[PDB]
Symmetry: C2
Subunit: 112 residues, 2 copies
């Protein structure tokens, strides 16, 4: 399929994370989901104000590139990769792109 | 129309900015465009490596919200708002959301 299935899983996981996160004890900021199936980029963002302090950061950025799931940015506690594996994505189809290219071979995931 | 026209203009402007930016004298990083017409969020991102240093930042984030163009983040030199105005978007339909809500009334743009 396999990219078509990955798109469905990524969007499903980010959407559920966004909803589930509203029950956190930790401070809840306003969030945004940004899914683009043409450029194959998927983001979960915090976009808010704390008085006059701007809250603006990225929880997760995933890109589908080279027929694989490139995790470009991930500040979740357990890691998106853990959830993807639980949903049946093989480690060979996940790239921890938030790690420098030259270290990926020392991990349990694909280099590219 | 008017939101339908705004979507077309935002995507047009971000796509052209991304291409034009490759001719900059300033260091060029790999970039990503992320357009979502269902959540109405549009981003232009830098996503790259400089040796072992992660380059990961947002050039522009726009959201269409409340029937207006909310500029959530903008590190361009002249400002996206300037280009939108040049393309015929009225100042009353642009919100500088990167400014704290309570200061927007002191600007030339909408508060909300």
């Amino acid at each position: 399929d396999n990219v078509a299935e990955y798109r469905k899983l990524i969007k499903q996981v980010l959407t559920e994370y966004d909803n589930l996160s509203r029950q956190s004890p930790e401070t809840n900021y306003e969030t945004c989901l940004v899914f683009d199936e043409n450029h194959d980029n998927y983001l979960w963002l915090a976009v808010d104000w704390q008085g006059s302090k701007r809250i603006k950061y990225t929880y997760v950025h995933i890109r589908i590139k080279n027929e694989k799931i490139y995790i470009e940015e991930d500040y979740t506690e357990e890691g998106i990769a853990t959830e993807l594996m639980r949903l049946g994505v093989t480690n060979n189809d996940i790239v921890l792109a938030f790690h420098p290219p030259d270290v990926r071979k020392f991990t349990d995931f694909a280099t590219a």
